[PDB]
Design a protein around this nucleic acid. Structure first.
Lengths: 735, 249, 716, 94
RNA sequence: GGCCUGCU
RNA sequence: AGUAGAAACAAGGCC
């Protein structure tokens, strides 16, 4: 007899055992080298899906741009980006009519937010493409570098501390004859108008790793800092709009998505009488981002912001204007090998414009030949369409408009449709009195989608009777069925620290028990395995064992020293008291009454040199990138113990010409620590104002010395010493 | 005394003097987050990879004057080589366990008073009474429920001023809290935590967690109470219901 | 008017007033009289505060110039002259230290004698109105208020004047100096009434310059300016434009539904080529175990001593010789490496105490076997351009290979029971709730079912091997290291036992990226002759190292005993994911527990015990030439565990792609079997998407064969 | 200010085609002998939809009406109009 | 041969 | 050789 697990589906329905079809117990695919090939392929594919448009050359950037809007209507089922302006404007108008007051309200709240938003909001972001160094750097670092360059060039309106003023300075920089940047190898280099325009309109391309569910790798993009404020405002407007649309599912979580899917299916099927047939289409959109033209987003926003202050319209329109002229950096480059001479070489992507094509294979040779005409200063113009879901929410708005355009008031026919859209994925429930009606409805829905630059993937889509469908790895079969294979990768040690890892593991087990219908015995097994892996990872074994490690000696002496050994934490080699009933309690508090007072005091000592807290945002928040989803943050319950240390940093900056960044880091951190000691609320509430550091610090020294004498340790001798030391630092700052 | 003294020492050197002079208060946050350290994409892989090194964690410089450089057999506990972009020094994990067996001891009696939420959870569970398990299909319907069982009927911003006035009374600014509920909360949490020396930031964070109301959407069947939702994993399942009554009731 | 503040007042005050001007964001060129008025207010604040000191008594000491001493206390300490944030900082600090009441508006000074605030304001109008005006602005105030006015008069409540009168003569002399100096200037046409409390501003975000031209190039094809396009949008109204283009659009743009029937789906085609080879990092079906029967636990013990003790338990060693060559390497190197390992093992046996971890010598043998100094040296392009052989890295579709029957048998025997327990679980909090007791009983049942399973043994082998390899790579980056493959089990009798499959030599492991490869050489004992399925051992070199005698009724077999030696490699990501193989247990048993719960939701009672003991119900878990064979729930547990283990062992992008694109077709087939009239828009496209994932991986090809068999058995 | 001249009318067979052009938003309108004006295209009327296509060249300053699959009921003077400004019309007889 | 780094 | 698979590793750089 030959064993075959798949035959199990002959008795257990597919959805009731779908977890077996998710090989999420092995290493996910990773990219190894350059992503330049993928970037070039994506650029060429985006440009050839809109080949029948019209070509122009921008007078500012001098780059060739392709406009397919209002182009010839498609005559085949292949992907097409020839969106029609009038059709999309009409779709938005119908969306407004079905939801009166949506645009005006959303614009009102967006106007409030834009005029009260601060610059620091841009620091709350992941890697961004700093143009000062032409590389990806943390959002805060890139923002600081750009602000420094602007201030050195004379653009100091951002000193007002307002994001709108920062954007005003950004736009004013576009009209400057010559800017100056700094490079280390420090050298001051001058950038002319066109070079700075291209550096501000460019995107950095990388390869996406840890992407499960496809054989081929893809490319993703990261924009600069000049354009992120406009993107933030536009996405704020789009989120405020989608929050008023029940057909959208992008700005919500997973459980809300499931609830809305259940509600829509029940509404569609229940209202349908015996005569009407119902069919569900589990649709995926092929080349979703490559076929969405930024000009059409400009049209949608300018229709949304009608009868609004002109400044609001301008600030919300700046973003799509820059995306329509966006450029993409090709990537890291290409690495060549010569086996005859036994050597390797790494050529940067910027040489692709001039480098001969003898080194490249046929596929890459043709890709380079096709993309060369669009190469301007080492970057390729990508006007026709978006690169990687930067306007997720606006795309969801367009999809929701398409979904609502079939409310049976615009169809003008017996058939009708509804459903749920989340960018690149949708479920469409279509009802009609007969199979011919369903066919006509789906055909018209597809045709209308093709008029908006949205394509339906026929290969990854199928239609059945309502009651069974899929949506973003959520399988609905007369009710959503748990999978538990999507969350399997999150059952190990997170990698934050000991206490954080313990709390995160127990909380993940608890949550997957609540949401993903994890069984009790399975949860106990998960707890046991997690504890085993945790002890084997942090070298913290039970203590009563003879497992020799680098940490087994101190742990054993602590074990033999303690009297009530049941109170020792698993991190210190103690027994595990966790169970299904204790999954919502931190380890420290669960073992508090069992700890010896000496060990308890040594553990939770504020003066410990290991605990370090930076800001209110990073107290008990851990960023865990979930499998098959975007990066997410979790609140984990933990007590600040000596085990809450933060791990070592990379330390490879020491071998790079960018070595002075570490000295600047140290000096900035010293100044920030001094300010915090002067202003204790610096971390919890970020200080605001327009004065400089030393003014506030010296003046508060004055006052605090005064009052702490009026009652406290200070003495006249010390108070006068502080006053004249303040005068000394004053005259020092003078010179 | 000291604080202004390292201030003067910083202003002595030209670079830090320029940083202090030209940098305005508003930019405080930016430069504080200014770092070359990228946020890790795969934390688990490197935590499993770094812990195999010697000196994998980081600690303040003060550790060099509280913990000896080596233990009884000579296993090193800390190194004097500083981190990449900080004055902290890289140290071995043993320096943690050492601190828990011969490090300085204090009076942790006030931690229960600080971490009110967690200890209240423990007390509620310790006095709970279980019941028979009933096996029948559960119609889990998804609903918006409040998870925090100690929220004082305050929002984030609404309680943020209360938290500042409780911890940072001088940086409150214009705000003087009007609602009398906030008055009593301030009085109680002021007299209760009058000399607690854990940290201002952690105290503020835990006060925010305790007082601020927070809500999330979850699949529930029955219950719906704040105390009954924290144990939702233990009382409700796919085909079984476990009757439970927390210690509070 | 600004010429006056150019002339008279000192710098300090003028820049203080200029920063106060910047504070609230209004411009000085439009209205300057406010600047002069508030700078005079600030000047009176200074001149009233300075020159006034106190000592330990009350009765302020007044000195025209502060002498060098600790006695420089200031009688009145200023509030204004600071930012709003700091003004409120001082207010709150004074309130919290003085125990006084917090005012709602900005004071100007604080004093000790009377322990309270002073709000100085000198207005153009006479005092006896401005005083009570600001008084009714401030609610129930105990802070004393004092104001002057140009005529020279003073006033205050309580008839209180807080310091010397010569200072006030100073104030009013300053005051009339101001007055009869404007007399020379001539400003009272507006000086009395120049500020009325104007607060208004309009936010301006104007598109101009280059950024405007960009806006003119981001419009539809037939538009010339953003102004015109916005006007058109504002004037646009729906007039049935979607219908017109829908009618005009070609009818070939359709989404016709192709019915999906029993005869529609065709079997997935498998690639053809040379048979598929073995990819695992260790032997799974052909492993052999040398044991000692020690009482130590899994992690307890020292590796090298245990390995040597286990190997000494076997007698019959012969001089090794080549049996099956690598066919691409230098087998004599493998032979010499094996003999070197034996020699150095003896060398450890001789000395005092077995080292916890041993380093081996870097001979040419393992230099070749571990691929040392073979990475091409990195150079610059400008120095290597004329080399004809210089080209890209080989980037093409992997070699095509057809499925072989060995993977099927390997999976078959990976789901079989064993004579040992390969899982020793940790401790949990004592169960207190009845649901916890039910969970514990279920868990005990599953552990009894799966512990005696080859899948669990493979899990432990992989976890231990990858953990040791990762730790050695991170610790001994430079020097080759010896690691014996160790796994500890427990017999039926209950006696604990150790097992030594072989050895692993780890090489240079300077791993920077998650994809960087660490090469090692693995040696494993076995009894399976490699002359029967050679195509499965394409990358192995197999020697003959001894003879084994296992008790059998046919005299005694005296079988040969071979050594499978190969060069393999891994990476940080692969090591990390292989050291988390225990979650296969989770996956499998979660699936089984979901089955049990779903069935128990029907009958209102827990159904675990009868499922595991009666074994009445069975699921299709394989096909025999007679037909489909069904097994008890325990066999399903073992089968799913083996499937998860093989997923973790043979993981690859092909597996992910095939899994997704075959789950799609499985859902379609399930819809067909449920009588839900399934339909497809392009089924050929889906088939081509599935078939492109099957290239050379044995596991994915076996999964595809299983899928074809399931289709054949289904659709009936 | 806007003068308009139509071209491209004449005698045609039933089921034939005809491309009207008007040299100068814009409309095509028709007048049969026994009636007032009828809307053709600007959007198209029910009686002419799918048969007839309206298209402009703004660089040539011309509006075109491409008539196909003509019926005896298309027989009219076809007038071009600009929006107040009306051509003299071109005779089409089917 | 000596020393530096391992997400920069 | 080996790992791996649309491009890489099989140490890097600095003296």
């Amino acid at each position: 007899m030959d064993v075959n697990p798949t035959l199990l589906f002959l008795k257990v329905p597919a959805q009731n055992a779908i977890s077996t079809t998710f090989p999420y117990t092995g290493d996910p695919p990773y990219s190894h080298g350059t992503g330049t090939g993928y970037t070039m392929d994506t650029v060429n594919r985006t440009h050839q899906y809109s080949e029948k448009g019209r070509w122009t050359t921008n007078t500012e950037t001098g780059a060739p741009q392709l406009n397919p809007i209002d182009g010839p209507l498609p005559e085949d089922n292949e992907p097409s980006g020839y969106a029609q302006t009038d059709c999309v404007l009409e779709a938005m108008a119908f969306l407004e009519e079905s939801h009166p007051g949506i645009f005006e309200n959303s614009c009102l709240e967006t106007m409030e937010v834009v005029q009260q938003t601060r610059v620091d909001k841009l620091t709350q972001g992941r890697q961004t493409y700093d143009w000062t160094l032409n590389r990806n750097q943390p959002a805060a670092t890139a923002l600081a570098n750009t602000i420094e360059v602007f201030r050195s060039n004379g653009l100091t309106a951002n000193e007002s501390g307002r994001l709108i003023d920062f954007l005003k300075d950004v736009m004013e920089s576009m009209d400057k004859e010559e800017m100056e940047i700094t490079t280390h190898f420090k050298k001051k280099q001058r950038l002319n108008k066109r070079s700075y325009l291209i550096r501000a309109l460019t995107l950095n391309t990388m390869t996406k790793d840890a992407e499960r569910g496809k054989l081929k790798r893809r490319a993703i993009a990261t924009p600069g800092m000049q354009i992120r404020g406009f993107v933030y405002f536009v996405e704020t407007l789009a989120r405020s709009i989608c929050e008023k649309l029940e057909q959208s599912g992008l700005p919500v979580g997973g459980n809300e998505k499931k609830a809305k899917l259940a509600n829509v299916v029940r509404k569609m099927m229940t209202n349908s009488q015996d005569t009407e047939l119902s069919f569900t289409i589990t649709g995926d959109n092929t080349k979703w981002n490559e076929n969405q033209n930024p000009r059409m987003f400009l049209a949608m926003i300018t229709y949304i912001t009608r009868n609004q202050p002109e400044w609001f319209r301008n600030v919300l329109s700046i973003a799509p204007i820059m995306f329509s002229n966006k450029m993409a950096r090709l990537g890291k480059g290409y690495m060549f090998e010569s086996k005859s001479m036994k050597l390797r070489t790494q050529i940067p992507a910027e040489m692709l414009a001039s480098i001969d094509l003898k080194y490249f294979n046929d596929s890459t040779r043709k890709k380079i030949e096709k993309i060369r005409p669009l190469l301007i200063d080492g970057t390729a113009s990508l006007s026709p369409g978006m690169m990687m879901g930067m306007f997720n929410m606006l795309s969801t708005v367009l999809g929701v408009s398409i979904l609502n355009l079939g409310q049976k008031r615009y169809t003008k026919t017996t058939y009708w449709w509804d459903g749920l859209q989340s960018s690149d994925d949708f479920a469409l429930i279509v009802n009609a009195p007969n199979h011919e009606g369903i066919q006509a409805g789906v055909d018209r829905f597809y045709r209308t989608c093709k008029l908006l630059g949205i394509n339906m993937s026929k290969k990854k889509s199928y239609i059945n009777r309502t009651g069974t469908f899929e949506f973003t790895s959520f399988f609905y079969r007369y009710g959503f069925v748990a999978n538990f294979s999507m969350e399997l990768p999150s059952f190990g040690v997170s990698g934050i620290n000991e206490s954080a890892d313990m709390s995160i593991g127990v909380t993940v087990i608890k949550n997957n028990m609540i949401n993903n219908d994890l069984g009790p015995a399975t949860a106990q097994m998960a707890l046991q395995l997690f504890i085993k892996d945790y002890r084997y990872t942090y070298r913290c074994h039970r203590g009563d064992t003879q497992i020799q490690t680098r940490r087994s000696f101190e742990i054993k002496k602590l074990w033999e020293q303690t009297r009530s050994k049941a109170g020792l934490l698993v991190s210190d080699g103690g027994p595990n008291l966790y169970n299904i009933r204790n999954l919502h309690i931190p380890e420290v508090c669960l073992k508090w009454e069992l700890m010896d007072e000496d060990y308890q005091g040594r553990l939770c000592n504020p003066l410990n040199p290991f605990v370090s807290h930076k800001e209110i945002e990073s107290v008990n928040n851990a960023v865990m990138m979930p499998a098959h989803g975007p990066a997410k943050n979790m609140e984990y319950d933990a007590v600040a113990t000596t085990h809450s240390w933060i791990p070592k940093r990379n330390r490879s900056i020491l071998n790079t010409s960018q070595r002075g960044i570490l000295e600047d880091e140290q000096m900035y951190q010293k100044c920030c620590n001094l300010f915090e000691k002067f202003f204790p609320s610096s971390s919890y509430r970020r200080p605001v104002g327009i004065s400089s550091m030393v003014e506030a610090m010296v003046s508060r020294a004055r006052i605090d010395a005064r009052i702490d004498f009026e009652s406290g340790r200070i003495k006249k001798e010390e108070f006068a010493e502080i006053m004249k030391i303040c005068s000394t630092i004053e005259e020092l700052r003078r010179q | 005394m000291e604080r202004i003294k390292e201030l003067r020492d910083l202003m002595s050197q030209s670079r830090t003097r320029e940083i202090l002079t030209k940098t305005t208060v508003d930019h405080m946050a930016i430069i504080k987050k200014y770092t070359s350290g990228r946020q890790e994409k795969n934390p688990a892989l490197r935590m499993k990879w770094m812990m195999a090194m010697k000196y994998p964690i980081t600690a303040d410089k003060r550790i060099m004057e509280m913990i000896p450089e080596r233990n009884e057999q000579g296993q090193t506990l800390w190194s004097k080589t500083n981190d990449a972009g900080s004055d902290r020094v890289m140290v071995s994990p043993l320096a943690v366990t050492w601190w828990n067996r011969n490090g300085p001891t204090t009076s942790a009696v006030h931690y229960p008073k600080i971490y009110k939420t967690y200890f209240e959870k423990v007390e509620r569970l310790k006095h709970g009474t279980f019941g028979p398990v009933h096996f029948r299909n559960q119609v889990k319907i998804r609903r918006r429920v409040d998870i925090n069982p100690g929220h004082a009927d305050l929002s984030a911003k609404e309680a943020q001023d209360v938290i500042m006035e409780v911890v940072f009374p001088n940086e409150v600014g214009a705000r003087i809290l009007t609602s009398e509920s906030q008055l009593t909360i301030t009085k109680e949490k002021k007299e209760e935590l009058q000399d607690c020396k854990i940290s201002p930031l952690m105290v503020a964070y835990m006060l925010e967690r305790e007082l601020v109301r927070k809500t999330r959407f979850l699949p529930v069947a029955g219950g719906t109470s704040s105390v009954y939702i924290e144990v939702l994993h233990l009382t409700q399942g796919t085909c079984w219901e476990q009757m439970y009554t927390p210690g509070g009731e | 008017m600004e010429d006056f503040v150019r002339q008279c007042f000192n710098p300090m005050i003028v820049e203080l007033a200029e920063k106060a001007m910047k504070e609230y964001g209004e411009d000085l060129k439009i209205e300057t009289n406010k600047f002069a008025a508030i700078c005079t207010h600030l000047e009176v604040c200074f001149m009233y505060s300075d020159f006034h000191f106190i000592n330990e008594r009350g009765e302020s000491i007044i000195v025209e110039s502060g002498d060098p001493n600790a006695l420089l206390k200031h009688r009145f300490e200023i509030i204004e002259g600071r930012d709003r944030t700091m003004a409120w900082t001082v207010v709150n600090s004074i309130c919290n230290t003085t125990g006084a009441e917090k005012p709602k508006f900005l004071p100007d000074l604080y004093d000790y004698k009377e322990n309270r605030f002073i709000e100085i304001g000198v207005t153009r109008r006479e005092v006896h109105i401005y005083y009570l005006e600001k008084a009714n602005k401030i609610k129930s105030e105990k802070t004393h208020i004092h104001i002057f006015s140009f005529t020279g008069e003073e006033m205050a409540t309580k008839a209180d004047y807080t310091l010397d009168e010569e200072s006030r003569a100073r104030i009013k002399t300053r005051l009339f100096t101001i007055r009869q100096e404007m007399a020379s200037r001539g400003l009272w046409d507006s000086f009395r009434q120049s500020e009325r409390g104007e607060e208004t501003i309009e936010e301006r975000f104007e598109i101009t310059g280059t950024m405007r031209r960009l806006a003119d190039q981001s419009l539809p094809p037939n538009f010339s300016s953003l102004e015109n396009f916005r006007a058109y949008v504002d004037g646009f109204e729906p007039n049935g434009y979607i219908e017109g283009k829908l009618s005009q659009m070609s009818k070939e743009v359709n989404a016709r539904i192709e019915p999906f029937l029993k005869t529609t789906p065709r079997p997935l085609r498998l690639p053809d080529g040379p048979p598929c080879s073995q990819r695992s990092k260790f032997l799974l079906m052909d492993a052999l175990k040398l044991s000692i029967e020690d009482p130590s636990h899994e992690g307890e013990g020292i590796p090298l001593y245990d390995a040597i003790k286990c190997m000494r338990t076997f007698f019959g060693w012969k001089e090794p010789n080549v049996v099956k060559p690598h066919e691409k390497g230098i087998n004599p190197n493998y032979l010499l490496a094996w003999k070197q390992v034996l020699a150095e093992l003896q060398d450890i046996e001789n000395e005092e105490k077995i080292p916890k971890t041993k380093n081996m010598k870097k001979t040419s043998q393992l230099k070749w076997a571990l691929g040392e100094n073979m990475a091409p040296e990195k150079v610059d392009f400008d120095d290597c351009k004329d080399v004809s052989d210089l080209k890209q890295y080989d980037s093409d579709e992997p070699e095509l290979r057809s499925l072989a029957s060995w993977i099927q048998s390997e999976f078959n025997k990976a789901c079989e029971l064993t004579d040992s327990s390969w899982i020793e679980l940790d401790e949990i909090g004592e169960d207190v709730a009845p649901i916890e007791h039910i969970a514990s009983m279920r868990r005990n049942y599953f552990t009894a079912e799966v512990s005696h399973c080859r899948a669990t043994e493979y899990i432990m082998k992989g976890v231990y091997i990858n953990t040791a390899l990762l730790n050695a790579s991170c610790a001994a980056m430079d020097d080759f290291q010896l690691i014996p493959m160790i796994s500890k089990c427990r017999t039926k009798e209950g006696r604990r036992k150790t097992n030594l499959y072989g050895f692993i030599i780890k090489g240079r492991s300077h791993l920077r990226n998650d994809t960087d490869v660490v090469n090692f050489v693995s040696m494993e004992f076995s009894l399976t002759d490699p002359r029967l399925e050679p195509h499965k051992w394409e990358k192995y070199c197999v020697l003959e190292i001894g003879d084994m005698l296992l008790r059998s009724a046919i005299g005694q077999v005296s079988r040969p005993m071979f050594l499978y030696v190969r060069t393999n490699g891994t990476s940080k990501i692969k090591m990390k994911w292989g050291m988390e193989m225990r979650r296969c247990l989770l996956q499998s048993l979660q699936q089984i527990e979901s089955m049990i719960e779903a069935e128990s939701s029907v009958k209102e009672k827990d159904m675990t015990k009868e499922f595991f003991e009666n074994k009445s119900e069975t699921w299709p878990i394989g096909e025999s030439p007679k037909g489909v064979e069904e097994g008890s729930i325990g066999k399903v547990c073992r089968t799913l565990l083996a499937k998860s283990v093989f997923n973790s062992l043979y993981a690859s992008p092909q597996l992910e792609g095939f899994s997704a694109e075959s789950r799609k077709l499985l859902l379609i087939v399930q819809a067909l079997r449920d009588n839900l009239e399934p339909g497809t828009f392009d089924l050929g496209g889906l088939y081509e998407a599935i078939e492109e994932c099957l290239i050379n991986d044995p596991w994915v090809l076996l999964n595809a064969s299983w899928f074809n068999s399931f289709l054949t058995h289904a659709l009936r | 200010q806007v003068q308009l001249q139509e071209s491209g009318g004449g005698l045609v067979q039933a089921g034939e085609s005809l491309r009207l052009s008007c040299a100068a938003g814009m409309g095509w309108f028709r007048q049969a002998p026994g009636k007032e004006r009828e809307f053709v295209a600007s959007y198209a009327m029910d009686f002419v939809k799918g048969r007839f296509t309206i298209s402009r060249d703004n660089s040539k300053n011309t509006l075109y009406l491409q008539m196909n699959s003509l019926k005896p009921e298309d027989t009219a003077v076809y007038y071009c109009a600009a929006a107040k400004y009306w051509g003299q019309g071109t005779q089409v007889t089917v």
